[PDB]
Amino acid sequence: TKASCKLPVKKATVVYQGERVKIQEKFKNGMLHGDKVSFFCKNKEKKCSYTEDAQCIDGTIEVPKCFKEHSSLAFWKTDASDVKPC
């Protein structure tokens, strides 16, 4: 069987097939099973951002740790989802 997943967040921006979209909208009803999506993150040793491809499973998924649900304290720092790739 292939049970879809479940949008772990309400504002996650990933890159499906080379496309930036908000899992909270493109996957309003969870994500397809096996659906692969990359999460935008930032690099300190490189000073740039990149994507962390991911994989969906039967109503289950392992979001990339580097990701960040929301992390309060929004100070001078653009979210990897809005940074330029190294």
Curated annotation (Swiss-Prot):
* Compartments, record wording: Secreted
Detail the disulphide connectivity of this chain as listed in its UniProt entry: C5-C56, C41-C66, C48-C86
Q: What is the effect of changing C66G?
A: Loss of phosphatidylserine-binding
- Source organism superkingdom: Eukaryota
Give a brief account of the tissues where this protein occurs: Expressed by the liver and secreted in plasma.
Q: Cite the residue spans of the region called Sushi-like.
A: 4-86
What does the UniProt record tell us about how this protein is modified after translation?
N- and O-glycosylated. PubMed:6587378 also reports glycosylation on 'Asn-188' for their allele.
Query: Its function?
Result: Binds to various kinds of negatively charged substances such as heparin, phospholipids, and dextran sulfate. May prevent activation of the intrinsic blood coagulation cascade by binding to phospholipids on the surface of damaged cells.
Quote the protein name from its UniProt record.
Answer: Beta-2-glycoprotein 1
Q: Which organism is it from?
A: Homo sapiens
Gene expressing this chain: APOH
Section covered of the full-length record:
260 to 345 of 345
